[PDB]
């Protein structure tokens, strides 16, 4: 029913595969829930910058989304910008972060 | 094409129209950056909560997106949750905020 935990490893392999299939992507940054970049189509220095910082922004995002009332929990935090896109999906074990071009 | 636009205010009418055409939406909250809900398919108390708070979260989002390095500026801040989806598009003068059901 509700998203707590699944057969993670298979779901991750599926989704990671799918993240590779979504064309327009420039740099996949798949990190553990603490910001550990397991796979990366983006530079290591760059992943180090984004993974830890974005995690902390996510922590805040959790705080503001919940600040209203414990109605909403963060399922996707997808930020789109001019140069590139930064899609961050909070998972309970992972974070599917993908830097893509400004294509939906 | 960034200094020369086709329209400006007509763009809002277009986009607002289009925001109504995206089936799955529950509450459109279109606000000025001033924090003024001009149109709303959402309850006034609820829009008051989200409009001002989210604006301040956006201020922070601007800070953190720029904290990395001035490489991008916030074009879309779209948050998807369990209860609902909260899509926030930073505009020149507006913020296109739309509470929708987060369709997979």
Curated annotation (Swiss-Prot), chains A, B:
Modified residues (N-acetylalanine): 10
Subcellular location: Cytoplasm, Cytoskeleton
Main localization, broad class: cytoplasm
Record carries keyword Acetylation: yes
Pfam families hit by this protein: Robl_LC7
Domain of life of the source: Eukaryota
GO biological process: microtubule-based movement; visual behavior
Molecular functions per Gene Ontology: identical protein binding
Keywords in alphabetical order: Acetylation, Cytoplasm, Cytoskeleton, Dynein, Microtubule, Motor protein, Transport
Cellular-component GO terms for this entry: centrosome; cytoplasm; cytoplasmic dynein complex; dynein complex; microtubule
Family listed: Belongs to the GAMAD family.
Known partners and oligomeric status: Homodimer. The cytoplasmic dynein 1 complex consists of two catalytic heavy chains (HCs) and a number of non-catalytic subunits presented by intermediate chains (ICs), light intermediate chains (LICs) and light chains (LCs); the composition seems to vary in respect to the IC, LIC and LC composition. The heavy chain homodimer serves as a scaffold for the probable homodimeric assembly of the respective non-catalytic subunits. The ICs and LICs bind directly to the HC dimer and the LCs assemble on the IC dimer. Interacts with DYNLRB2. Interacts with DYNC1I1 and DYNC1I2.
Cited function: Acts as one of several non-catalytic accessory components of the cytoplasmic dynein 1 complex that are thought to be involved in linking dynein to cargos and to adapter proteins that regulate dynein function. Cytoplasmic dynein 1 acts as a motor for the intracellular retrograde motility of vesicles and organelles along microtubules.
Protein name: Dynein light chain roadblock-type 1
Organism: Mus musculus (Mouse)
Gene name of the encoded protein: Dynlrb1
């Amino acid at each position: 029913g509700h998203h707590h935990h699944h057969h993670l490893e298979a779901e991750v392999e599926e989704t990671l595969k799918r993240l590779q299939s979504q064309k327009g992507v420039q740099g996949i940054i798949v990190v553990n829930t603490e910001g550990i970049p397991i796979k990366s189509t983006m530079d290591n220095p760059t992943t180090t910058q984004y993974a830890n910082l974005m995690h902390n922004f996510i922590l805040k995002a959790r705080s503001t989304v919940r600040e209203i009332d414990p109605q909403n929990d963060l399922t996707f935090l997808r930020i789109r910008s001019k140069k590139n896109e930064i899609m961050v999906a909070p998972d309970k074990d992972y974070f599917l972060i993908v830097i893509q071009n400004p294509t939906e």
